[PDB]
A paper describes a structure:
We designed a triangular protein using three orthogonal CC heterodimers concatenated in a single polypeptide chain.
The asymmetric unit contains one TRI-4SHbGCN molecule with a triangular fold as designed. The triangle is nonequilateral with a shorter GCN2 side (34 Å) and two longer (47 Å) P1:P2 and P3:P4 sides. The electron density is continuous for the entire chain, except for linker sequences, where only two linkers have clear density and could be modeled in the structure. A closer inspection of the TRI-4SHbGCN topology revealed that the chain forms a relatively shallow protein knot, known as the trefoil-type knot.
Residue numbers in the entry: 2 to 34, 37 to 133, 135 to 163, 166 to 198
Write the structure that this text describes.
């Protein structure tokens, strides 16, 4: 089915999109690097991020709400993708296949573009890394900087009251389940 194609290419492109962004940043740091200077300032940046992780960790008194919020955010993601799958089929049934096939065409063009750039970016980094020892240190420290960045934001999506948060997410789940049901009713109505 066309929507099986659409889903696949969106999955693959977003990952490419994310991975290319990281490579862009690495090259931007290694071309700009005076590399010893760049290393020092990455240490300080990672130092500041690790203390923020610690600060935010202490603002979390219990992991039990954290677990719950994480669980609800996952459920919300499941429900949204399923609602999107139902809306696409419903549009397709109502309005025909010309709209997916153009979307697919655009998605396969961007996919090829994204992969071409990925290969170029990755090729540039190997060249940039080259008989250099500082260069790997810079690689690791940027990688660490990426993970600490992600960790600070994870702890920011939590801390504000954790139970007010669970209250919100559970209301959103009610809305999505209501929407899911309407979309399935319209779908069965169409395929009758």
């Amino acid at each position: 089915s066309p929507e099986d194609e659409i889903e696949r290419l969106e999955r693959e492109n977003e990952k490419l999109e994310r991975e290319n962004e990281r490579l862009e940043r690495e090259i931007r740091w290694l071309e700009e690097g005076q590399l010893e200077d760049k290393v020092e300032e990455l240490l300080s940046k990672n130092y500041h991020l690790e203390n923020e992780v610690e600060r935010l960790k202490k603002l979390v008194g219990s992991g039990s709400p954290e677990d719950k919020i994480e669980e609800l955010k996952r459920k919300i993601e499941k429900l949204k993708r399923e609602n999107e799958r139902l809306e696409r089929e419903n549009e397709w049934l109502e309005r025909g296949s010309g709209s997916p096939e153009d979307k697919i065409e655009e998605l396969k063009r961007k996919n090829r573009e994204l992969k071409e750039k990925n290969k170029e970016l990755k090729e540039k980094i190997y060249r940039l890394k080259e008989s250099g020892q500082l260069e790997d240190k810079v690689e690791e420290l940027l990688s660490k900087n990426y993970h600490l960045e992600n960790e600070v934001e994870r702890l920011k999506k939590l801390v504000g009251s954790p139970e007010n948060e669970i209250k919100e997410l559970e209301e959103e789940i009610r809305e999505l389940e209501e929407k899911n049901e309407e979309l399935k009713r319209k779908n069965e109505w169409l395929k009758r």
